[PDB]
Structures are given as structure tokens and as C-alpha cells.
Amino acid sequence: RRSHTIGVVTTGLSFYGPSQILVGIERAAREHGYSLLLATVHEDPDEVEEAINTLRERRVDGIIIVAPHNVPPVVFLSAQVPTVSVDQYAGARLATEHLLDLGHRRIALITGPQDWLEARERLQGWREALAEAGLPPPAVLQGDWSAASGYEAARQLLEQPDFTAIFAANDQMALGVLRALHERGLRVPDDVSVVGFDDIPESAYFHPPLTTVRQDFEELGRQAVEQLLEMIEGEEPPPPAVLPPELIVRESTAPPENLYFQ
Amino acid sequence: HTIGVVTTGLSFYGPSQILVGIERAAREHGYSLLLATVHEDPDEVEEAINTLRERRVDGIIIVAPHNVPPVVFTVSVDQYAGARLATEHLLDLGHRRIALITGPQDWLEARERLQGWREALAEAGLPPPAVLQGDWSAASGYEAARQLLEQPDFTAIFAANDQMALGVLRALHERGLRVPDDVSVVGFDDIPESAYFHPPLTTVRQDFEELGRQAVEQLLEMIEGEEPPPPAVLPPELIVRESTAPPEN
Ligand SMILES: C[C@H]1O[C@@H](O)[C@H](O)[C@@H](O)[C@H]1O
Ligand SMILES: C[C@H]1O[C@@H](O)[C@H](O)[C@@H](O)[C@H]1O
């Protein structure tokens, strides 16, 4: 009547965030005696629904969704119903308020793909920080979490440069931004300040070490397992969890040149 | 019904990309994927095999430090040939003092990349120097490089993976050493980031996703009664970017 297995539908496993979330889920599920059924969905319409009903056939005790989407109990790692997530909006606010506090006023944003709710939330936290400072929000370039998209977006921004700081919506894209800036001969942070998001292990060894917003991906996945176990069993009503984000100040930000003329 | 996989070091690109290829190869062939993770104790994999066996799994795939039918990592990439070509390239550029930052010696990739580097130098008549050991992480590459720079008796460093090579580049730039104008650096994997390092990293390409797909390909033949197939080997490729050059000695 029970399988002692947990189904998980995740995407973007080539990146650090979803992998470490998957690491947190596997370790917590195993420490409570649960095997893990892993399903990956691609950029395909409603492929998660196909994967959920596949897990349902495997008599799973519960399901954790780590992907954009929307009975065996289900837990989502977004908003939507039980949810476990990091305050993305407040994190982008910290990143943008960091730059504003240094004197930057023309702060570009390279965002993720809009089908990810985190990308929209980080966009709005950036916009609201500039609006509170009385600044109109510039035109936003869109990436896809890849370093290539960051590098390509930064080259577009450099065609007619009107910024002193770039907020890349994650660290992967920030690496490409750093690349494009070095190519053009621009120093970081002296000519252009760069802030990322995620705090992936590589970011501390970028050139220069990148200021970023830390997400605890592992604990995110463990808390998701804790929420799902409480619903599988003699409970169900869970606390909607919000994990706090943390700004990791390193070496890629500095007051702009011509500080008092910004 | 289902397929079992025991893997480790999922926070790295390589193991995660292999798992991606295993998942898609089983999703298209009607198999669900059971995931078991091991850490550093080698008595955890045999414990994780028996767990999937109790779950009545049709086949297991081992992607961790290894030795009804499991496919163990056979399917592989010629690690020895990969590091041998990288060392030969540096020698061809004129380097003669080529340091090696190896990986965890319990990993067969680490042991076999160190062998290809050693034997490439030995064929040339050169003596292999002392090796420093990392853990795949960017921190161990940075800390191993800083140790080398207490006595810079080299013009090139060969780090056993792109993660560690990023730490090496950081320790070199901190000490004001131009790359490759003063020190050449080579990695291994071709992670998506390495093309955007400062400078873009010369490295050896592994087809991780293909590696996982072949693991399921060989596994299904053992399940459907086609008997154990022969081992397969995927050739690695040397990708020469901007992090290598002849030395200025
Ligand atoms: C790929 C995608 O994965 C999530 O875990 C991260 O929060 C996000 O920044 C992005 O890196
Ligand atoms: C972390 C470890 O993962 C393996 O898949 C790679 O072959 C190796 O180079 C290293 O990256």
C-alpha cells in the first residue's frame, strides 16, 4: 500500500541550483528511508504533467516539483498549495540596493527567461529598488541562464554603453558578462560593477571574485522533503516557507567613476 | 519497469550531465529512473546496490568509484588518451616544466589522467615532478596553485578538471602572472563555463550526456537478453583556446 519512494520532476540539471536542490532532496529522502524517482523535463509543453502521471503509475508516496509548470501529495518549489522557496524579489532588491548605495544610478539588468517565476521576481525587485530611488527602469535584456547568453547580452549593452553596473540574474550569465567586459578592455569594478545571483562555487574564483546573492539550494531541497513527509502522513497543513537570501560582497563592485555626476 | 543509478559528486557538471543522458535514454525507452547517491565511504555503493536490488530494478548503472545486471563505469571516455594529448600539446608549445594538479586518487579518471601526463613526459625523456592533489573543487585548485607559486619552477600547469583550473587562473592573476604570457593552463571536461573564463580555457572535451546514453544502451541489451556487450570508449577532444601558448622563457 506504500512504496517508500519520492518522485521528483526537475529541469536544468546542468546548472548548480537545480543539482544542489536535487542533492538536498536525495539526502533528506534517504535519511528518512525513501528512494528517489527522478524525472527531467525539457523545453516542452506540459511535459511535467506527463512526468507526474508517470510517477503516479509508479505508486509514488509523494511528488516534489522543481520546474516551471501549472491523489499522491505534491509539493512545489515556487509560489502557486504547499510551497518552499527563497525570497527572490528581496534578493534582487539587496543586489540592486547594494549598487545604488555605492553611487550607481544607471544599472543594467540581464534577466533570465520569463517563463521562470524567479526571473520575473528578480526583475521586479530590481525595478522597485530603482523606482524607490526615483529612477526610471532601463530596457531589459533577456538571457537564458547560460554564460553565452550573458556574454551576448553584455555585448549588446556595450554597443552604445549607457551603464556603470550590470545586474546579471544569475552567476552563469555574470561569467559571460565578465568575459565581454574584459574583451572590450573594461575593468571590473573600476569601469563597470557586476553583481550575480545564486552564489555558485565558481563565483568566488571568477575574475574578479563576483558579488552575488546566496541561495541555500541544499536546505531548500531538504525542507521540500520535510514538507512532503508531513503531507504524506499524520499531518498535511504545512507552513509556507520562505528562506532568506544573503548578499555575498566580494570584489566585483565599487563606486562608479565620476561618482558625483551620476 | 525501472532502472537504478548510483552516482556521486552531483554538484559538478560532469556527473549531472551523465545523469541527464541516463534519464533521457530511459525516458524514451519506457524505463523510470531510481536515484541513489553515495559519498566518500566505498562501502556505500555496495549498500546502495542492494537497496535497488530489493526495489526489483531491472538494471543498475554505477557512476561512482567502483571496483540484475549493472553497467559500471562498460562505457567510458579514454581518460588516459585525453591527458596524454594535453601534455603533448604543451610539450609541442615548448614547455618542459609542466606541473600537474591531480584529482581525488580514488577516482579512476584522476589516476588515469595522472598516468597519461606522466607517460607523456617520460616518452620525451623528462622527469615528472611532484604532483599536488585536489578534490575537483575550484578551492583545491586555487590552494594547490598557491603552493606551487612558493617556488615557481614551471611554465605551465595541467589541472585535472576545469573547476580546479578556474582556481588556478585565480591564483595566477592574484600573483600578477599573465596567462598564457607567463604560465600556460590546461583543464579537462569542457564545462560550459570554461569558454568564458579569463582567459578562455584550453581543455579536453568529454561527451557526458552521450556517455550516459550509452550506459542505458548497453544496459537494455543485458536486460532484454542480448548478453553482455563489449566495452565501448568515447574519444575525448582537445579544445585549444587562449589559455595556452609557447613559454616566454
Ligand atoms: C538555472 C536556474 O536554477 C535555479 O536553481 C537558480 O535559482 C537560478 O538562478 C538559475 O541558475
Ligand atoms: C567532478 C568530476 O566529474 C567527472 O564526471 C569528470 O570526469 C571529472 O573530470 C570531474 O569533473
Side-chain angles (χ1 to χ4, degrees), chain A residues 2-5 13-16 19-20 22-23 26-27 30 35-42 44 47 54-55 58 147-149 151-152 172 175-176 178-179 182-183 200-209 251, chain B residues 1-3 10-13 16-17 19-20 23-24 27 30-39 44 51-52 55 138-140 142-143 163 166-167 169-170 173-174 191-200 242:
Chain A
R2 292 262 190 104
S3 52
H4 294 177
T5 69
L13 271 182
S14 61
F15 299 86
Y16 179 75
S19 273
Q20 210 61 21
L22 181 52
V23 163
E26 199 280 333
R27 310 192 148 169
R30 186 252 322 296
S35 280
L36 203 84
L37 265 172
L38 174 76
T40 67
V41 296
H42 196 33
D44 297 299
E47 189 170 11
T54 281
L55 298 155
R58 255 50 180 177
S149 71
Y151 170 82
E152 229 74 47
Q172 275 301 112
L175 180 59
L178 291 179
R179 170 65 187 143
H182 294 164
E183 268 186 339
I200 66 175
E202 304 102 319
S203 61
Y205 305 94
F206 286 179
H207 192 253
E251 301 181 46
Chain B
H1 322 87
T2 48
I3 288 184
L10 269 206
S11 91
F12 296 93
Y13 175 80
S16 281
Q17 197 64 15
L19 187 55
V20 164
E23 203 275 343
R24 303 160 176 204
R27 161 212 317 160
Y31 277 80
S32 270
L33 195 45
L34 268 204
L35 174 60
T37 274
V38 292
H39 181 266
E44 302 181 24
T51 295
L52 308 167
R55 219 71 207 119
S140 71
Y142 171 87
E143 285 142 11
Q163 278 295 303
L166 179 71
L169 296 171
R170 179 63 203 160
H173 276 107
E174 253 193 19
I191 61 179
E193 300 95 326
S194 69
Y196 302 90
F197 285 180
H198 180 76
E242 306 174 9

